Swiss-Prot record, chain B:
It is found in: Cytoplasm, Cytosol; Golgi apparatus membrane. The keyword Repeat does not apply. This is Conserved oligomeric Golgi complex subunit 4. One of its GO terms (molecular function) is identical protein binding.
Length: 249, 250
């Protein structure tokens, strides 16, 4: 399994080297085209054939980048997802319906996020050693998206109280901080849904959502539908179903 | 300027050839990558379809690059080579081929056309050989060989011969072919087949002697001249009677 995974990646990495070489040749050829016709030799037929060649190289160069992205998303889904999924699922077994004694226990011995980060670090270390930056970065980006998607799914299965919401806010901010260190990209957009869920899960009372919603939305652009907002409010065990359903969103 | 424009064009086109060969070697590496990628049970429908499409596209563009190179070389030949070569060939017209021994001997002592023509060609060929890859150089000399054959045929058909003039032409043609043979492939024989056959006709002792070499009497030779063209070439001999030429059953 590990062999077949790394072979796939190393092969894609060589596709990327070849693709970069095609781009460098295209640039040499663009300069050749200008030089070739610069002194009155070469008519319409040669000029049209050269333009057509260059256009074809632009087109296939775009296709090679798409191939690489497709390869990496398939690798991520086939080989990385099966490893990450259990680590994310572990969140479900950490109570987020907690009193101060448990919250203080969690402050002293972190129950999930720190080990999750260590697991991601080890996993990603295998790739950074063997892949070019462009490939490593793209793969890291896919892993980051996978983490946001799967974390959202396990949160939606979990039960919170107010202090558990506070715990989740710390865990989420820690995770986003780590994933930010491993890339040059901003991951704020990828984590916007989770950040908005953390806001909901930290409300003092159901009706407090109205302070951040609709006309009072102000800065924040909600990525969640009213139905999704109600689904997240419902994760709070202290938030009454009847009250959530009747909320004017 | 026009020599430097010509050489700049050729050197640039030669670089295009180097690039296209590099594309071909990359395509080969990529074909091996595609096989290796799917060899261990990872990879789905989309990655397979995309990779196959990428390779098909590289195949298509390699064909277009070959087309471009050939177009480039034929235009260079027409634009930069033909205008130098045409005057050199047209000079044949000013050399009498209706001659007696005194003039034939003059020509032996001081060659009137072909040796300078060969020198003129050599200077071009050597310029090309020093700056171009074998593939481009060979393609270019093939185009040049064809051009010389076409243009020399035209000027011959405008010229007047007697027997000894025909003998002079046979020497001149054999020297030219001997030279060109050293810069192109064996196809020179086919390119110059019409001219060699014209030389045979221009070296006949009498009109009826053509029947010794024609039709059933061809032997291994396949004539590349029509009956009308044979009569046209016979007519270049000022000593040959129109009546006799028309008599021939070809």
């Amino acid at each position: 399994t590990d062999e077949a995974k790394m072979s796939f990646l190393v092969t894609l990495n060589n596709v990327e080297v070849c693709s970069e070489n095609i781009s460098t040749l295209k640039k040499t050829l663009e300069s050749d085209c200008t030089k070739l016709f610069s002194q009155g030799i070469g008519g319409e037929q040669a000029q049209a054939k050269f333009d057509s060649c260059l256009s074809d190289l632009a087109a296939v160069s775009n296709k090679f980048r798409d191939l690489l992205q497709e390869g990496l998303t398939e690798l991520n889904s086939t080989a990385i997802k099966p490893q990450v999924q259990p680590w994310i699922n572990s969140f479900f077994s950490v109570s987020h319906n907690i009193e101060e004694e448990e919250f203080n226990d969690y402050e002293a011995n972190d129950p999930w996020v720190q080990q999750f980060i260590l697991n991601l670090e080890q996993q990603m270390a295998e790739f950074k050693a063997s892949l070019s930056p462009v490939i490593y970065d793209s793969l890291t980006g896919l892993m980051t998206s996978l983490v946001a998607v799967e974390l959202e799914k396990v949160v939606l299965k979990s039960t919170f109280n107010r202090l558990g919401g506070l715990q989740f806010d710390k865990e989420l901010r820690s995770l986003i901080a780590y994933l930010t260190t491993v890339t040059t990209w901003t991951i704020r957009d990828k984590f916007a849904r989770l950040s908005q869920m953390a806001t909901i899960l930290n409300l003092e009372r159901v009706t407090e959502i109205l302070d951040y919603w609709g006309p009072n939305s102000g800065p924040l652009t909600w990525r969640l539908t009213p139905a999704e907002v109600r689904q997240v409010l419902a994760l709070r065990i202290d938030f009454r179903s009847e009250d959530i359903k009747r909320l004017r969103l």
